[PDB]
């Protein structure tokens, strides 16, 4: 995407994650396991919900074309009415389509931003105790069990662990 | 050798959206917001039945055209419906002065 | 036909909840705003893979 995470430096998405748009997949002696980073997923869910609410409520006074009947010698005023309603409906269709397109763009890029930001959050803690394998994974230079991974998830990784 | 990996959700979906820079982008879950289906039946409005003028024009109903005895007595309505080109009209020819203005007034009664 | 709906168009009724529609300009009821488009999909998820 615009930030390079989705279909970028991370190859593709995990079918095995069902409870979050983003997450971790840890593998140590205590097994492997997926986990959802709930907080970032909630940021994204709020984003999308507020976007849908905005789309619904920002065009809640659009235009209502009520019908007016005219005789045969009021062709001018009838045509005025006709092309007026036509023009209003055209401009409001334009507005709806632009909103839909621009929001699709911003939303896809928002998700990309969230993935890149999560990768950066992990990297900024793991600074030197680990090494980037280039595709979204981090190799731990020390031994660290499931509570290590939990401290990484909730954001409290303790840097003093000897790593050689 | 422990290792942690970061990834994102995906699935076997096909629902496609459009972007201003790209067409037919496939996403995971998308919400349609446009309605395209109707039933084709002139159904009641908030329970109060319309006044479906079967074959009369507004002028015929108001004046009381003999072929319009369906509408000697009308109950309250919600909206008046008439054909595009009625056939029961001012049966005796002529005109209805400021016809359309009376139609406009009807649109509020 | 013997129905009951909360919106009416000269070519059918709309028992729908979406914010937009493209049936016919002239309506009456608490029904959505007319739009001249054939598709309005909004992306909630993220790009598939």
């Amino acid at each position: 995407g615009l930030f390079g995470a989705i279909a970028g430096f991370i190859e593709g998405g995990w079918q095995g994650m069902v409870d979050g748009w983003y997450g971790y997949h840890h593998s140590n002696e205590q097994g492997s396991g997926y986990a959802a980073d709930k907080e970032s997923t909630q940021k994204a869910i709020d984003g999308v919900t507020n976007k849908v609410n905005s789309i619904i409520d920002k065009m809640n006074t659009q235009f209502e074309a009520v019908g007016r009947e005219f005789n045969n010698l009021e062709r001018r005023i009838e045509n005025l009415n006709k092309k007026m309603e036509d023009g209003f409906l055209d401009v409001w269709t334009y507005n709806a389509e632009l909103l839909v397109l621009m929001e699709n763009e911003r939303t896809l890029d928002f998700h990309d931003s969230n993935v890149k930001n999560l990768y950066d959050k992990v990297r900024l803690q793991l600074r030197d105790n680990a090494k980037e394998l280039g595709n979204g994974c981090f190799e731990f230079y020390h031994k660290c069990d499931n509570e290590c991974m939990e401290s990484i998830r909730n954001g409290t990784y303790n840097y003093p662990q000897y790593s050689e | 050798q422990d290792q942690i990996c970061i990834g994102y959700h995906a699935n076997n979906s096909t629902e496609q959206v459009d972007t201003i820079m790209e067409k037919n982008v496939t996403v995971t879950h998308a919400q349609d917001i446009l309605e395209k289906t109707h039933n084709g039946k002139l159904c009641d409005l908030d329970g109060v039945k319309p006044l479906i003028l079967r074959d009369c024009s507004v002028a015929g109903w108001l004046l009381g055209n003999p072929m319009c005895d369906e509408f000697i007595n009308v109950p309250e309505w919600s909206y008046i419906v008439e054909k595009a080109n009625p056939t029961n009209d001012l049966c005796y020819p002529g005109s209805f002065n400021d016809y359309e203005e009376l139609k406009h007034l009807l649109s509020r009664i | 036909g013997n129905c009951n709906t909360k919106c009416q168009t000269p070519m059918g009724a709309i028992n729908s909840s979406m914010p937009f529609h493209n049936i016919h300009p002239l309506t009456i009821g608490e029904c959505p705003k007319y739009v001249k488009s054939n598709r309005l999909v909004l992306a909630t998820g993220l790009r598939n893979s």
């Epitope: 409870d19 869910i45 | 959700h9 699935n11 076997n12 995971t28 | -």
Partner: antibody
């Protein structure tokens, strides 16, 4: 609508193999819009999430931490059922086990809030 | 992992009286939260999910609200059938549960 009907022996010898089986009616265990969880409730521990399975492209198993390597959940489409298989049972497992269908979503993603439940199977371990 | 607290640990009110329960999560994930009811001897029964949305088939007398770390479940007029143990869950973990007792 949906129905989950549980079965399995209520008495299981210590350190032996516990095995419950939740038969489904009204949907498909191969549904792409749900997941199938196993929960346990005890007066001491309350409700605890044990395990989960689902199907997107392969069969996915999501187990808990209190049952690391101690649990296995299977889905059999031939009978439309899914099965809980818990090894090395100890006295701490005496509880009521529920099979649930996690499947109320919010923008397509499954929050895990259980949606339908089985009538529960009480299970005690003893000598 | 995540730890939930639930308050009060028990209560007692009469029919008709409005009661409220609070589930405090250490995390703010607004939706992912869900309130279940448990009568004695029966499995839970999902009442509210996403902390403000109601499951189909539940009487309207329940209502979920709140955000940040504090979520609330409000019952407007109790019933002899609402006597129960109410649980709140955060995506995989259930709160200890409160006991709604009928005072008469």
């Amino acid at each position: 609508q949906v129905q989950l009907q549980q079965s399995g022996p209520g008495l299981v010898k210590p350190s032996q193999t516990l095995s419950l089986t939740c038969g489904i009616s009204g949907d498909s265990v191969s549904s792409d819009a749900a997941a199938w969880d196993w929960i346990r409730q005890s007066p001491s521990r309350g409700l605890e999430w044990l395990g989960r399975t689902f199907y997107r492209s392969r069969w996915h198993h999501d187990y808990s931490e209190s049952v690391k390597n101690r649990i296995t959940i299977n889905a059999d489409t031939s009978k439309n059922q899914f099965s809980l298989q818990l090894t090395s049972v100890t006295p701490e497992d005496t509880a009521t086990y529920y099979c649930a269908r996690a499947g109320v979503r919010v923008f397509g993603i499954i929050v895990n809030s259980l949606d339908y439940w089985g009538q529960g199977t009480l299970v005690t371990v003893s000598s | 992992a995540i730890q939930l607290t639930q308050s009060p640990s028990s209560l007692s009110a009469s029919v008709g009286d409005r009661v409220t329960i609070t589930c405090r999560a250490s995390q703010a994930t607004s939706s992912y939260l869900a309130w279940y009811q448990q009568k004695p001897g029966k499995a839970p029964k999902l009442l509210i999910y996403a902390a403000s949305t109601l499951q189909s088939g539940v009487p309207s007398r329940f209502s979920g609200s709140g955000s940040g770390t504090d979520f609330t479940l409000t019952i407007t007029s109790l019933q002899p059938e609402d006597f129960a143990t109410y649980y709140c869950q955060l995506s995989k973990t259930f709160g200890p549960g409160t006991k709604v007792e009928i005072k008469r």
